[PDB]
Amino acid sequence: AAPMAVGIQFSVGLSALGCELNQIKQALQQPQQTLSLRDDLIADRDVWVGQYTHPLCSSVPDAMRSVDSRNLRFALTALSKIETELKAYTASFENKRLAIVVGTSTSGIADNELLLKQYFQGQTDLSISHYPQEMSCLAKALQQYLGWEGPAYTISTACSSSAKALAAGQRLLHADLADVVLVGGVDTLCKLTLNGFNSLESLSAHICQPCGISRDGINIGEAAAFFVLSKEQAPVMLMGAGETMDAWHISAPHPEGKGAALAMQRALDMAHISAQEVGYINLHGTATPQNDAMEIKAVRQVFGVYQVALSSTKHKTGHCLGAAGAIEAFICEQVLKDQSWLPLHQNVEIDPDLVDQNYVQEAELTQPIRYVMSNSFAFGGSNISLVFGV
Amino acid sequence: VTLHLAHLTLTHAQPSYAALECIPAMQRRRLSPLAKLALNTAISSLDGRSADYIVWVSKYGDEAKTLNILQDVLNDQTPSPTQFSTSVHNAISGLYSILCQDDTPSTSLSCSWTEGLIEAYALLKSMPEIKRVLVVAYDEPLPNIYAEAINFPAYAMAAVVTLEQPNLQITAWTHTDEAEAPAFAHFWQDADQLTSAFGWNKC
């Protein structure tokens, strides 16, 4: 048995894929084009983004007005999909044993970009509030909303933030610090991320082509995804996590994938499974030249050649940055629950260097699978791989 | 939550940093002031030893650097890519790992000193191969453009945490508060003070 396994009791995943479970599954099983064009994020240019194209709650509770932001509204919109059943569930645990670990790379920064522009253009006598854009605001707002009294804190490690939050909640449970942990992440679209990544030349000119022969960068997306973890059994369990640091470059991955391969192997080890037992890998698969070349090298090192179905879903959700790992974990859970489909890889000509793998070209799953893996490889060489099982 | 805490070091701004001698001066000079503080304190607390995991903790990160990037962005200019890449919340953890050639796994949190210690405990208690955790907190005051901005001396504080023969117990973790690193240092270094209202006790 896997000594670190924790059950996913509840989950929610809001993203460009949709806001109802049936919609999201169909979007991943079909060549639906789910990204949206935006002309208001980068000057003199339209970008394809993974936009949540549904309304957010028009209000935050009264006692939380000070921290209101689109990011928090997104978070509370997702949480309210499970809140009723969650409150029924948590009744049997002590309030101090209900913990929260969440990831974000944006918090509410989008809401201050307007005021900061006005500050820089003239009105030098306005008072902008900082707490709604602080990273810690997320976990503390969620804690206040739920009335929980266990530890609550925020992980902010760029693209690996929310995946590391899942791994943190697993640890909190098996360190006897909590009996229930809300984990996941929420990021929202903003000018800072779109223009920051544009300055690194990391953005595609159109829609991203993960592992494609002529891939040219990423599309950014927003997502709000949460999981309720406990030590008890559940239809899908989080079984293993592997975390490493490249210690190579501040914004380019180790070119041999040494950090990524080790993260994947450590996840398998913690789950007590071999690479052969994995039925699907959800790649990080951002569609930059550097990431996909590095990642498929690491996959080949750990899994071999033509051995495991895999796909990137970042052409559907976009690269959701701090929330990438959580929304991708949500996809992995649904795959394991349904035993029916796998998420389509982008229909593109694969780079010849990367073609020796079984990219998901058609959604039908023909044999049941027991274990799935999801990768997140971030800035500062922060790597994590998660293993889920039934 | 009970921990053995050792090698507590609290650093403030200095004209030069002894611990940073191991980093070649060209790269050392390109560290932001806050990056110098954090890396100096991390090396100092480690004291030549190693750790199995590093927990970096910062409420604000480098808000001054993010402000300059945002000015360019909100002026429809393309920001500096090196500034952006070193403005992310985990940039210091990544700089430490590269410049000190230490690939120890790490995380970067936005929270108080107590929650950093909780994350360390969870790592030690749940992971058999993690036996020593380094916890490094750092912050500098917010740009005065923000309404809540208050001046304080920029700081980094680090310690090495292990499980056996604990000398520290954490009895409360919902206030969390002003339960910052400077308040902890005051409590930890007062030989007559055995308990703290922030929920810490010596044992």
A270 and A216 fall within a common domain: no
A168 and A247 fall within a common domain: no
A218 and A292 fall within a common domain: no
Q: Determine, yes or no, domain membership for A73.
A: yes
Q: Determine, yes or no, domain membership for A1.
A: no
Q: Determine, yes or no, domain membership for A347.
A: yes
DSSP A335: H
Nearest CA in chain A to B125: A175
Contact A153 B147 (CB under 8 A): no
DSSP annotation string for A154-208: EE--GGGHHHHHHHHHHHHHHTTS-SEEEEEEEE---HHHHHHHHHTT-B-SSS-
Burial of A89 (0-12, 13-18, 19+ CB in 10 A): middle
Q: Determine, yes or no, domain membership for A75.
A: yes
Q: Determine, yes or no, domain membership for A20.
A: yes
Tell me the two tokens of residue B4: 């053995």
Question: Residue B173: its chain A contacts at CB < 8 A?
Answer: 150-151
Question: Domain map of chain B by residue range?
Answer: 4-202
Does A159 participate in catalysis according to the annotation? yes
How far is residue A177's CA from residue A214's CA, in Å, rounded to a whole number?
A: 48
DSSP A88: H
Which of A240, A271, A288 finishes a domain?
A240
DSSP B146: B
Question: Which technique was the structure solved with, according to the deposited record?
Answer: X-ray
- The three-state secondary structure class of A299 is helix
A116 and A183 fall within a common domain: yes
Contact B79 A172 (CB under 8 A): no
Phi, psi of B124 (to 5 degrees): -65, -45
A284 and A227 fall within a common domain: no
Gap from A27 CA to chain B (nearest CA, Å): 32
Domain B4-202, CATH among 3.30.420, 3.40.47, 3.90.320, 3.40.50: 3.40.47
A287 and A344 fall within a common domain: yes
Q: What is the largest CA-CA distance in chain B?
A: 57
All residues at 6 or more sequence positions from A245 whose CB lies less than 8 Å from its CB, including other chains: A259, A380, A381, A382, A383, B93, B94, B97, B103, B104, B105, B106
A167 and A255 fall within a common domain: no
Domain that holds residue A371: 241-387
Q: How many CB atoms lie within 10 A of CB B4?
A: 16
A173 and A83 fall within a common domain: yes
A278 and A216 fall within a common domain: no
Of B142, B144, B201, B191, the C-alpha closest to B171 is B201
Q: Look at chain A and report how many structural domains it folds into.
A: 2
Distance from the Cα of residue A99 to its chain's centroid: 20
Of A191, A247, A251, the CB nearest to B103: A247
Which of A189, A222, A240 finishes a domain?
A240
Which of A240, A269, A289 finishes a domain?
A240
DSSP A4: T
Gap from A248 CA to chain B (nearest CA, Å): 6
Tell me the two tokens of residue A123: 């009105």
A296 and A175 fall within a common domain: no
A26 and A172 fall within a common domain: yes
A273 and A191 fall within a common domain: no
